[PDB]
Write a protein that binds this ligand. Structure first.
Ligand SMILES: CC(=O)CC(=O)SCCNC(=O)CCNC(=O)[C@H](O)C(C)(C)COP(=O)(O)OP(=O)(O)OC[C@H]1O[C@@H](n2cnc3c(N)ncnc32)[C@H](O)[C@@H]1OP(=O)(O)O
Ligand SMILES: CC(=O)CC(=O)SCCNC(=O)CCNC(=O)[C@H](O)C(C)(C)COP(=O)(O)OP(=O)(O)OC[C@H]1O[C@@H](n2cnc3c(N)ncnc32)[C@H](O)[C@@H]1OP(=O)(O)O
Ligand SMILES: CC(=O)CC(=O)SCCNC(=O)CCNC(=O)[C@H](O)C(C)(C)COP(=O)(O)OP(=O)(O)OC[C@H]1O[C@@H](n2cnc3c(N)ncnc32)[C@H](O)[C@@H]1OP(=O)(O)O
Lengths: 230, 230, 230
């Protein structure tokens, strides 16, 4: 929403990519462009690991609702495809990816969060696929992302019932991996990233793909199936 | 077992369907007929959500053991097929379904319980697929129902070892979603149902099916495979 | 490593098979041969259940690193194939199998552990697929074994991040089923085994296979795919 919604900072073995559009980090075309460019920077720098953060208010409130509800079909399709493409890129990323969930993560915000190898949040941040609560069916690509992380029963309630998770319930459900106090969420994320950069990169990259093979295939299908959804 | 084993009561936005055959709510042909008819009533009333309860003694002790062990093959086949058909109907039901687990849930009782979008029990109610303990192999349709809800490791022990779950262990395993005191299990179920009726029905119905697609397909196969089991 | 690395002791309804090569119970050809022979003994004795233990130092430190890194391709292939064959044999074993995790279980040690119907450890024993930390990609057969037991999110971190689990985190993740004090790990294992011997054997054997059908098929493929890995 702001003109310059993503910052990139390299600190030794890691790259820190921060979303702040001055509002709720809506994942519209400009934000997606800025995130892809930031990842290109990390590629160029051949960093050991990535940390992705939100701002002080949210991790992200999801796709841009203005575009989603504008009545223009192809722009909405393209926004959704771009968001799930970014999810694909992060889930298959050859370096460890750590998410600093610095506030609430709703819908595409929660799906983006769910692409990190490690995810840190504070206890009062809501994580929810709210689609059903607002009259939308969850796209197949999103379901596959959630199915990769959420326990079988948590997955059931997260989808059909739009259940909100947080703190201990998010940890148990598999929506996050670590709970920390708000003031140290980013620091904990950076610490984990520095540790994971110590793993063998080749083995990490190859193994993560094997552990996500079916999901990645289904996500590709889901991306090519977005049009059909509309 | 009693002549009139199911009651149907509409309360504002929900329908409450209660099993009480005066004994252990055996899921024989009469009980299955009564449950299907009660669901037909909820369809006619276009209710916002369903609550299904057991009695003061059990949720259900499962299929009628008398019929199961009578030596008459086709009646046993038909009873099993009907039970898993009912499971299918509830898992695909277009409105939120909340189970009030008012006592122990054994075998088909536990599988029926596992068809609710939300399931509430008290801490001392046993939930168990006891088939292996009594010399029976678990039908594929039942396995698919359990695999939809139980964590990977809980699923292993629930099946091959006939493990009994309750209270905190049932919650962790995914055999239930909420623990409440016995005297408020039904009230909590009704409260949740009223909340879920507030979700968008079209989106709930479409999303729940997507979140259960593979299970539903496998359950259909399992229903058509019952004969082969005998 | 020692000349006589496995002991077999029949106690009433169970057989106790103990690994102790005088070091870290490396799963090389001699150890695999001794374990298979011990299982043959249990077959001959038609025991009610199996307990498999490590020594005072570890459950097992995994495959023999000397052979793995010797530069001789076929011996390394054969060692890996034999280890996953043993895993297959135990996962499909017609009697209940209980693992007494008497110390750390690393890599193939953790995969072997994950083949038990019930697994008991003490709280400070590390359970880890350390492959990525040491520059190796996890074999598909190993991934399938882990995917059978670890929750969706634990599976992600166990593989790509070589996460170490122990105590409460191992229990939650699905790397173990029971935590006990070190001095009673074996006793608890034997107690559980005696209980499981009371289950109907025919039903246990048939049900466990159904609950593991996809994993077993994929493990067979993974065994035939070991060569390709090298
Ligand atoms: C289609 C898909 O399958 C999934 C896609 O992601 S669709 C996007 C779905 N996302 C949503 O519906 C978000 C619902 N909103 C929220 O959860 C909360 O607003 C929030 C947690 C994101 C922020 O909460 P908050 O800090 O307390 O601020 P709040 O009082 O709620 O209002 C947020 C402001 O940003 C706007 N906003 C919130 N989410 C937005 C989004 N995804 N796109 C565009 N604007 C958004 C609100 O309209 C409001 O704007 P104004 O105050 O200027 O009128
Ligand atoms: C074939 C499949 O794959 C799965 C199918 O579901 S097969 C059904 C498998 N179900 C069982 O084996 C049930 C085993 N029984 C139980 O778990 C317990 O009886 C219970 C939890 C259901 C009730 O426990 P309880 O309130 O303490 O009563 P309890 O003292 O155990 O006895 C229950 C009474 O109902 C009967 N009963 C229990 N389950 C029954 C069933 N599923 N069908 C017909 N009768 C049943 C018992 O025979 C006993 O009858 P009587 O006292 O008249 O002789
Ligand atoms: C290829 C695959 O996909 C998976 C296969 O399993 S490959 C095997 C991977 N396993 C490993 O890398 C094991 C790494 N080592 C460990 O985790 C720890 O050594 C352990 C937990 C096994 C034991 O810890 P410990 O009791 O504190 O003893 P520690 O001080 O670490 O040293 C262990 C001793 O046994 C040796 N050892 C440890 N694991 C071994 C293995 N898998 N094969 C052969 N030797 C091994 C060490 O070299 C050391 O030997 P020396 O003291 O004689 O030089």
């Amino acid at each position: 929403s702001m003109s310059d919604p993503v910052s990139y900072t390299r600190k030794d073995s890691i790259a820190v990519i921060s979303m702040d559009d001055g509002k709720v980090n809506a994942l519209g075309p400009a934000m997606q462009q800025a995130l892809n460019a930031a990842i290109d920077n990390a590629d160029r720098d051949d960093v050991g690991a990535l940390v992705i953060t939100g701002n002080g208010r949210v991790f992200s409130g999801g796709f841009d609702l203005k575009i989603l509800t504008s009545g223009e079909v192809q722009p909405a399709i393209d926004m959704l495809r771009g968001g799930f493409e970014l999810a694909y890129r992060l889930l298959s990323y050859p370096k460890p990816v750590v998410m600093a969930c610095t506030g609430h993560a709703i819908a595409m915000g929660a799906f983006l969060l769910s692409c990190g190898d490690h995810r840190v949040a504070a206890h009062a941040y809501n994580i929810q696929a709210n689609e059903v609560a607002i009259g939308m069916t969850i796209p197949y690509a999103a379901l596959e992302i959630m199915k990769l992380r959420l326990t079988r029963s948590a997955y059931q309630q997260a989808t059909g019932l739009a259940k909100t998770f947080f703190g201990e319930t998010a940890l148990a459900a598999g929506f996050i991996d670590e709970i920390a106090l708000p003031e140290v969420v980013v620091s904990r994320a950076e610490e984990a990233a520095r540790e994971f950069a110590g793993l063998n990169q080749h083995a990490h990259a190859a193994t993560k793909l094997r552990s996500r093979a079916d999901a990645l295939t289904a996500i590709r299908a889901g991306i090519d199936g977005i049009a059909a959804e509309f």
